[PDB]
Motif scaffolding. Structure first.
Motif, PDB file in Angstrom:
ATOM      1  N   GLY A 114       3.948 -16.066  37.504  1.00 32.01           N
ATOM      2  CA  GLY A 114       5.280 -15.504  37.482  1.00 32.01           C
ATOM      3  C   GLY A 114       5.194 -14.057  37.916  1.00 32.01           C
ATOM      4  N   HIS A 115       6.297 -13.316  37.820  1.00 35.53           N
ATOM      5  CA  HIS A 115       6.307 -11.957  38.364  1.00 35.53           C
ATOM      6  C   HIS A 115       5.216 -11.095  37.752  1.00 35.53           C
ATOM      7  N   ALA A 116       4.992 -11.225  36.439  1.00 38.32           N
ATOM      8  CA  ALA A 116       3.989 -10.397  35.775  1.00 38.32           C
ATOM      9  C   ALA A 116       2.602 -10.625  36.356  1.00 38.32           C
ATOM     10  N   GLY A 142      25.286 -12.409  35.014  1.00 36.09           N
ATOM     11  CA  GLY A 142      25.986 -12.860  36.192  1.00 36.09           C
ATOM     12  C   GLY A 142      25.653 -14.266  36.659  1.00 36.09           C
ATOM     13  N   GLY A 143      24.802 -14.992  35.936  1.00 36.46           N
ATOM     14  CA  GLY A 143      24.297 -16.270  36.425  1.00 36.46           C
ATOM     15  C   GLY A 143      25.243 -17.424  36.129  1.00 36.46           C
ATOM     16  N   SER A 144      25.343 -18.331  37.094  1.00 35.45           N
ATOM     17  CA  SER A 144      26.215 -19.498  37.003  1.00 35.45           C
ATOM     18  C   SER A 144      25.738 -20.501  38.042  1.00 35.45           C
ATOM     19  N   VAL A 145      26.389 -21.665  38.086  1.00 34.95           N
ATOM     20  CA  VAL A 145      26.074 -22.612  39.148  1.00 34.95           C
ATOM     21  C   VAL A 145      26.420 -22.077  40.528  1.00 34.95           C
ATOM     22  N   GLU A 146      27.169 -20.972  40.612  1.00 33.10           N
ATOM     23  CA  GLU A 146      27.474 -20.382  41.912  1.00 33.10           C
ATOM     24  C   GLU A 146      26.299 -19.623  42.507  1.00 33.10           C
ATOM     25  N   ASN A 147      25.311 -19.242  41.696  1.00 30.96           N
ATOM     26  CA  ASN A 147      24.190 -18.481  42.236  1.00 30.96           C
ATOM     27  C   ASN A 147      22.846 -18.924  41.664  1.00 30.96           C
ATOM     28  N   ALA A 148      22.773 -20.112  41.063  1.00 29.29           N
ATOM     29  CA  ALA A 148      21.533 -20.609  40.490  1.00 29.29           C
ATOM     30  C   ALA A 148      21.658 -22.106  40.256  1.00 29.29           C
ATOM     31  N   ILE A 149      20.516 -22.789  40.262  1.00 28.11           N
ATOM     32  CA  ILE A 149      20.452 -24.143  39.724  1.00 28.11           C
ATOM     33  C   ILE A 149      20.402 -24.016  38.211  1.00 28.11           C
ATOM     34  N   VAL A 150      21.428 -24.533  37.549  1.00 29.60           N
ATOM     35  CA  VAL A 150      21.503 -24.463  36.095  1.00 29.60           C
ATOM     36  C   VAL A 150      21.113 -25.835  35.563  1.00 29.60           C
ATOM     37  N   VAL A 151      19.992 -25.897  34.848  1.00 31.35           N
ATOM     38  CA  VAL A 151      19.432 -27.145  34.341  1.00 31.35           C
ATOM     39  C   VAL A 151      19.832 -27.283  32.880  1.00 31.35           C
ATOM     40  N   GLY A 173      24.776  -8.500  40.275  1.00 34.31           N
ATOM     41  CA  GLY A 173      23.422  -8.654  39.759  1.00 34.31           C
ATOM     42  C   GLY A 173      23.319  -9.910  38.910  1.00 34.31           C
ATOM     43  N   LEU A 174      22.273 -10.712  39.154  1.00 26.02           N
ATOM     44  CA  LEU A 174      22.062 -11.911  38.348  1.00 26.02           C
ATOM     45  C   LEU A 174      21.998 -11.561  36.869  1.00 26.02           C
ATOM     46  N   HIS A 175      21.218 -10.548  36.530  1.00 29.44           N
ATOM     47  CA  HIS A 175      20.978 -10.266  35.125  1.00 29.44           C
ATOM     48  C   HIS A 175      22.008  -9.313  34.536  1.00 29.44           C
ATOM     49  N   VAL A 207      14.166  -7.406  42.791  1.00 29.71           N
ATOM     50  CA  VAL A 207      13.928  -7.137  44.202  1.00 29.71           C
ATOM     51  C   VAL A 207      13.327  -8.322  44.935  1.00 29.71           C
ATOM     52  N   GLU A 208      12.925  -9.380  44.223  1.00 30.69           N
ATOM     53  CA  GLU A 208      11.986 -10.333  44.803  1.00 30.69           C
ATOM     54  C   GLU A 208      12.608 -11.206  45.889  1.00 30.69           C
ATOM     55  N   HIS A 209      13.895 -11.571  45.782  1.00 29.73           N
ATOM     56  CA  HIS A 209      14.484 -12.468  46.782  1.00 29.73           C
ATOM     57  C   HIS A 209      14.782 -11.730  48.075  1.00 29.73           C
ATOM     58  N   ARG A 254      16.939 -22.002  45.817  1.00 31.22           N
ATOM     59  CA  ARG A 254      17.625 -21.146  44.853  1.00 31.22           C
ATOM     60  C   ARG A 254      16.850 -20.964  43.553  1.00 31.22           C
ATOM     61  N   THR A 255      17.111 -19.831  42.909  1.00 27.73           N
ATOM     62  CA  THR A 255      16.611 -19.578  41.566  1.00 27.73           C
ATOM     63  C   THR A 255      17.191 -20.612  40.598  1.00 27.73           C
ATOM     64  N   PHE A 256      16.566 -20.723  39.433  1.00 27.83           N
ATOM     65  CA  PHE A 256      16.954 -21.748  38.480  1.00 27.83           C
ATOM     66  C   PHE A 256      16.712 -21.229  37.076  1.00 27.83           C
ATOM     67  N   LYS A 285       9.608 -24.752  45.427  1.00 31.84           N
ATOM     68  CA  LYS A 285       9.808 -23.953  46.635  1.00 31.84           C
ATOM     69  C   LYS A 285      10.396 -22.590  46.294  1.00 31.84           C
ATOM     70  N   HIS A 286      11.235 -22.514  45.253  1.00 34.59           N
ATOM     71  CA  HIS A 286      11.733 -21.201  44.857  1.00 34.59           C
ATOM     72  C   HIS A 286      10.615 -20.337  44.292  1.00 34.59           C
ATOM     73  N   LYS A 287       9.683 -20.940  43.551  1.00 33.09           N
ATOM     74  CA  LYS A 287       8.550 -20.164  43.050  1.00 33.09           C
ATOM     75  C   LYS A 287       7.719 -19.617  44.202  1.00 33.09           C
TER      76      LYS A 287
HETATM   77  C1  8GJ Z   1      24.470 -20.725  32.855  1.00 33.02           C
HETATM   78  O1  8GJ Z   1      23.089 -20.739  32.418  1.00 33.02           O
HETATM   79  C2  8GJ Z   1      22.135 -20.061  33.121  1.00 33.02           C
HETATM   80  C3  8GJ Z   1      20.862 -20.011  32.572  1.00 33.02           C
HETATM   81  C4  8GJ Z   1      19.846 -19.346  33.213  1.00 33.02           C
HETATM   82  C5  8GJ Z   1      20.046 -18.707  34.436  1.00 33.02           C
HETATM   83  C6  8GJ Z   1      18.913 -17.995  35.073  1.00 33.02           C
HETATM   84  C7  8GJ Z   1      18.745 -18.043  36.498  1.00 33.02           C
HETATM   85  C8  8GJ Z   1      17.708 -17.387  37.041  1.00 33.02           C
HETATM   86  N1  8GJ Z   1      16.808 -16.682  36.299  1.00 33.02           N
HETATM   87  C9  8GJ Z   1      15.689 -15.983  36.965  1.00 33.02           C
HETATM   88  C10 8GJ Z   1      14.596 -17.045  37.167  1.00 33.02           C
HETATM   89  C11 8GJ Z   1      13.267 -16.537  37.722  1.00 33.02           C
HETATM   90  C12 8GJ Z   1      12.583 -15.505  36.818  1.00 33.02           C
HETATM   91  C13 8GJ Z   1      13.383 -16.019  39.157  1.00 33.02           C
HETATM   92  O2  8GJ Z   1      13.821 -16.684  40.070  1.00 33.02           O
HETATM   93  N2  8GJ Z   1      12.946 -14.729  39.347  1.00 33.02           N
HETATM   94  O3  8GJ Z   1      13.054 -14.266  40.716  1.00 33.02           O
HETATM   95  S1  8GJ Z   1      12.052 -17.957  37.728  1.00 33.02           S
HETATM   96  C14 8GJ Z   1      12.820 -19.327  38.673  1.00 33.02           C
HETATM   97  O4  8GJ Z   1      10.724 -17.488  38.438  1.00 33.02           O
HETATM   98  O5  8GJ Z   1      11.869 -18.466  36.235  1.00 33.02           O
HETATM   99  C15 8GJ Z   1      16.903 -16.593  34.921  1.00 33.02           C
HETATM  100  O6  8GJ Z   1      16.061 -15.955  34.277  1.00 33.02           O
HETATM  101  C16 8GJ Z   1      18.014 -17.296  34.338  1.00 33.02           C
HETATM  102  C17 8GJ Z   1      21.326 -18.773  34.954  1.00 33.02           C
HETATM  103  F1  8GJ Z   1      21.638 -18.177  36.134  1.00 33.02           F
HETATM  104  C18 8GJ Z   1      22.359 -19.431  34.324  1.00 33.02           C
END
Ligand code: 8GJ
Ligand code: 8GJ
Ligand code: CL
Ligand code: ZN
Ligand code: ZN
Length: 300
Positions: A264-266, A209-218, A18-20, A77-79, A190-192, A237-239
């Motif tokens: 956003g999701h809300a 669970g988030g890292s550069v392996e499963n997200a764009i980390v800015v 799980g990402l979160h 569930v969104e992806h 990818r998510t970011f 495009k991810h949005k």
């Molecule tokens: C190593 O530092 C990290 C910092 C942040 C994240 C990270 C990644 C994704 N997300 C969900 C994004 C979002 C709601 C989404 O994709 N929902 O489906 S979004 C693009 O809509 O903001 C997060 O909250 C946080 C991470 F992995 C590593």
């Protein structure tokens, strides 16, 4: 022939985290009968808890779309739903061994590949579409989400990040899926998230669970992923990918157009709730001849 409902042709299995929550999770996608919809099942519980992937079961929308029933939840569930919407899957059981869908590579790509490898199965029932008949708009603050009538399916999104990696970049995109491929142009986005936030997020049991392996980390002034981006406009495009998955909580594919501004999701879920309540703004339609429909699907 008519446009038929689709389910899975074979059982699909995946393992991930799980990402979160960071929890290891086993995912199992199974065929389901006509008119089932997509139903999530917490199979770590006995008896199981089954949650239809429907707007009425959305419970939290902070950092992901969360389904809730009783005391339990299915997170993020969104992806997966975006992949299922993009491929036209009507009916499926989604079994999970933990509270959160595995993040995989952060995109819908791995789900799309796993599903298309197993194949889809058309079923002997007409596929139902929800056609937008009247504009429906919701706003809160500077955010806006709108459905407008449209003979097809089209999603547009605009973001506005006050951040040096985003200023001067492509922060608006529009995808008309009669001329642009979900699989090729959306599914791999990818998510970011932002490195600045990670200690704070983890303090809240988010992005564990988030890292550069499963997200764009800015980071503050650069993308940390050393292998780079898959699209120059991967963020927006991810949005759009997110919006497709959230919109599929309607329970049927859409004939219409979505426009999101900093949504956003809300707010996506508030748009769905307003649409459902505004029944003269939509209708259920089927197609006796796939050749004449405004949406087409690839072979199963
Ligand atoms: C190593 O530092 C990290 C910092 C942040 C994240 C990270 C990644 C994704 N997300 C969900 C994004 C979002 C709601 C989404 O994709 N929902 O489906 S979004 C693009 O809509 O903001 C997060 O909250 C946080 C991470 F992995 C590593
Ligand atoms: C939530 O409501 C939705 C309604 C429709 C779609 C949808 C339907 C079909 N298709 C396939 C188009 C096409 C064959 C393709 O992409 N092939 O790769 S195309 C450009 O050749 O017409 C898509 O992409 C997307 C969706 F995702 C969500
Ligand atoms: Cl109205
Ligand atoms: Zn996302
Ligand atoms: Zn109305």
């Amino acid at each position: 022939s008519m446009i038929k409902q689709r389910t899975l042709k074979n059982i699909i299995r995946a393992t991930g985290v799980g990402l979160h929550s960071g929890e290891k999770v086993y995912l199992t996608l199974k065929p389901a009968p006509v008119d089932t919809g997509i139903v999530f099942c917490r199979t770590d519980l006995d008896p199981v808890v089954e949650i239809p992937a429907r707007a009425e079961n959305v419970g939290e929308t902070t950092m992901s779309t969360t389904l809730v029933k009783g005391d339990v939840k299915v997170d993020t569930v969104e992806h997966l739903l975006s992949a299922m919407a993009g491929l036209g899957i009507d009916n499926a059981y989604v079994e999970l061994s933990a509270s959160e869908v595995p993040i995989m590579d952060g995109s819908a790509g791995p789900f799309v590949f796993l599903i298309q490898s197993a194949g889809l199965q058309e079923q002997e029932a007409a596929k139902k579409f929800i056609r937008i008949k009247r504009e429906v708009s919701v706003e809160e603050g500077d955010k806006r989400a709108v459905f407008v009538p449209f003979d097809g399916f089209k999603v547009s999104f605009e973001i506005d990040f006050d951040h040096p990696v985003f200023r001067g970049r492509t922060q608006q995109a529009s995808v008309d899926f009669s001329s642009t491929s979900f699989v090729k142009e959306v599914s791999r986005a990818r998510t970011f998230g932002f490195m600045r936030d990670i200690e704070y997020l983890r303090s809240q049991n988010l992005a564990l669970g988030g890292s550069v392996e499963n997200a764009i980390v800015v980071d503050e002034n650069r993308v940390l992923n050393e292998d780079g981006l898959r699209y120059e406009d991967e963020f927006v495009k991810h949005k759009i990918l997110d919006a497709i998955g959230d919109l599929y909580l309607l329970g049927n594919s859409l004939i219409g157009e979505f426009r999101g501004f900093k949504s956003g999701h809300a707010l996506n879920n508030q748009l769905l709730r307003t649409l459902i309540a505004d029944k003269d703004a939509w209708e259920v339609v089927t197609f006796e001849d796939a050749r004449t429909a405004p949406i087409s699907y690839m072979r199963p």
